[PDB]
Each structure stands twice: as C-alpha cells, then as structure tokens.
Amino acid sequence: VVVAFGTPEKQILIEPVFAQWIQATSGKALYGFDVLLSNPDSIASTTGAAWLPGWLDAINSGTNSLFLTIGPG
Amino acid sequence: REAKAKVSVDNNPVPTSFEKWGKPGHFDRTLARGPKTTTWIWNLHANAHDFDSQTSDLEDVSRKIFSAHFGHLAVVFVWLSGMYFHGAKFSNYEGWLADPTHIKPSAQVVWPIVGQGILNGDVGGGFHGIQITSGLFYLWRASGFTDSY
Numbered sequence: 001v002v003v004a005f006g007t008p009e010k011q012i013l014i015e016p017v018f019a020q021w022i023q024a025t026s027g028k029a030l031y032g033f034d035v036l037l038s039n040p041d042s043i044a045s046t047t048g049a050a051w052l053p054g055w056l057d058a059i060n061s062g063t064n065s066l067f068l069t070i071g072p073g
Numbered sequence: 074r075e076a077k078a079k080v081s082v083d084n085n086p087v088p089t090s091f092e093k094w095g096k097p098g099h100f101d102r103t104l105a106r107g108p109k110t111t112t113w114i115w116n117l118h119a120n121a122h123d124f125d126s127q128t129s130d131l132e133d134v135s136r137k138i139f140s141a142h143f144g145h146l147a148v149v150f151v152w153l154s155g156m157y158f159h160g161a162k163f164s165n166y167e168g169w170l171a172d173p174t175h176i177k178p179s180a181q182v183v184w185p186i187v188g189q190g191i192l193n194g195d196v197g198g199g200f201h202g203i204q205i206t207s208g209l210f211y212l213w214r215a216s217g218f219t220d221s222y
C-alpha cells in the first residue's frame with residue numbers, strides 16, 4: 001500500500017541484523033561487524049588453521065553463491 | 074379503502090415496539106433460548122429472511138415479504154439518490170458535457186491522506202478524481218440533464 005500510492009519511502013524495511021552478524025562470524029566483512037572471524041584481532045581468527053585464508057577469500061568475494069548478502073526482503 | 078374492490082386487510086395485526094430489537098433471534102424458537110455455542114450466532118444470520126422456517130402461516134409470510142420488498146425498494150432509492158447526488162456535487166458532469174471527446178468522466182473525489190490522494194487523477198479541464206465506468210454521464214446526457222442542480 002505504501003509503494004502503490006507513489007510514496008515508496010514509507011516501507012518498513014528492517015535489516016536482517018542477526019543473520020548478517022552470523023555471516024560476519026564466519027569472516028564476512030561487508031557489513032563492518034568485526035566480530036569473531038571478521039575481526040583479525042580475534043582469538044578465533046589467529047589460530048593457524050589452513051582453512052582460514054581460502055574460506056575468507058571465498059566468503060568475501062561477492063562473485064559466488066557463498067553466504068549471499070541479504071537485505072530486508 | 075375498499076372502493077368495491079377485492080381488498081382485504083387487517084387493521085392492527087402487529088403492534089409497533091422496540092423490545093424485540095433487544096432480543097436477537099426472536100424469529101427463531103431455537104435461537105430465542107439464548108446462545109450456548111457460537112453456531113447460534115451464524116444461524117441467526119442464516120435464517121434472518123427464512124420466513125418459512127419462522128412461521129407456518131402463509132399470510133404472515135406474504136406480509137413479511139411485502140414489507141421486505143418495500144424496504145428493499147427504499148434501499149435502492151437511497152442508492153440511486155446517492156449516485157445522483159455524487160453526480161451533482163462531486164462530479165465533473167458539466168465540464169464533461171461542455172467537451173466530452175477530450176475529458177474523462179470522473180466522480181467520487183478522494184480525501185488527500187496517507188497518500189491516497191494520488192487516486193484523484195487528472196481527467197480533463199483541471200478536474201481531479203476517479204474515472205467512473207458506470208456510464209452515468211452518458212445516461213444523464215441521454216435524459217437531457219444540463220445543470221447539476
């Protein structure tokens with residue numbers, strides 16, 4: 001009803017904050033959460049695990065289908 | 074009011090009152106005892122005009138039917154007068170009559186609020202409203218209406 005009347009600015013867009021935070025915990029730095037594996041200063045990110053570089057490179061390159069960026073929709 | 078006709082009426086069969094308006098379900102003996110289950114409500118609407126299930130007298134049923142006919146005719150008169158008044162004080166019937174081929178028949182103006190005012194599109198001659206499809210302006214021109222009064 002809001003978009004219909006030529007006033008699309010009153011749409012209730014609520015950010016999927018919890019799921020974006022979960023993505024960030026796996027190293028997603030798009031939303032600037034800097035929590036766990038999105039934070040280089042975190043203990044979980046400085047453990048010397050051979051899977052961290054490739055995982056972060058695949059999850060922070062917006063070219064595949066891994067942890068897709070989400071909006072209010 | 075006989076006038077040597079076949080007319081035969083009863084001068085006072087039903088008294089006028091408001092008490093039965095306070096007893097929903099007066100016409101049904103199964104509903105007069107009051108509700109116990111929600112079904113009671115629904116059936117109250119289902120048998121509202123079911124005059125046969127309310128009384129086994131064909132005469133009383135015919136009387137109820139006649140007065141209901143009168144009530145429905147009053148309702149249709151109210152609706153027709155609403156249409157005429159909305160064409161009178163809420164339509165562009167005169168601006169349309171002055172130039173039909175370049176204007177859209179509009180009526181029912183919308184109060185500008187919560188964005189809904191967008192529904193009052195420009196129909197021609199500066200008039201803003203909802204284009205009507207009932208064809209009332211064509212009927213009124215055929216009848217010969219010239220003035221909104």
Ligand code: CLA
Pocket residue numbers: 148155156159160180181192203204205206207208209
């Ligand atoms: C609040 C909304 C609303 C209202 C009340 C109206 C009102 C009206 N419009 Mg409009 N219209 C609307 C929305 C609305 N419109 C929208 C969203 C559009 C699309 C943009 C249009 C487009 C439109 C067009 C194209 C036309 C109209 C027309 C009309 C008139 C026709 C009469 C009629 O429809 O009888 C009512 C019809 C019904 C089916 C009744 C619906 C049942 C109701 C909702 C139940 C409530 C009634 C209540 C229980 C009564 C108790 C009964 C008891 C008294 C016995 C009327 C005065 C016509 C006109 O000529 O305008 C003057 C016409 O051509 N309208």
Ligand code: CLA
Pocket residue numbers: 087088089090091092093094095099100136137138140141143144145147148151
């Ligand atoms: C204010 C005047 C008035 C009053 C005090 C009464 C009183 C009574 N009438 Mg009655 N009647 C009236 C006018 C009135 N009538 C009119 C104008 C008509 C012709 C339509 C009738 C035809 C009539 C019939 C056929 C019957 C009664 C019956 C009754 C009795 C019970 C009604 C009931 O069950 O609850 C009251 C119920 C309502 C008020 C329903 C309201 C919903 C209505 C119908 C919708 C609006 C349509 C309306 C009729 C016309 C449009 C209204 C307008 C504002 C647009 C009751 C004592 C019943 C009876 O005899 O009991 C066994 C019965 O069968 N009346």
Ligand code: CLA
Pocket residue numbers: 122148149152
């Ligand atoms: C010759 C034309 C005509 C005819 C055949 C009817 C016939 C009928 N009208 Mg309607 N009416 C008309 C013109 C007409 N109307 C006009 C021009 C208007 C102004 C817009 C109305 C507005 C009006 C209202 C507000 C109501 C009626 C109702 C009724 C029904 C009376 C109650 C009943 O029978 O029990 C019940 C009947 C049914 C359960 C059958 C279902 C009816 C379906 C949905 C539509 C039937 C088509 C019908 C011709 C259109 C009526 C429109 C209306 C329902 C909005 C009846 C079937 C009353 C009603 O619907 O009863 C609840 C009602 O409240 N009429």
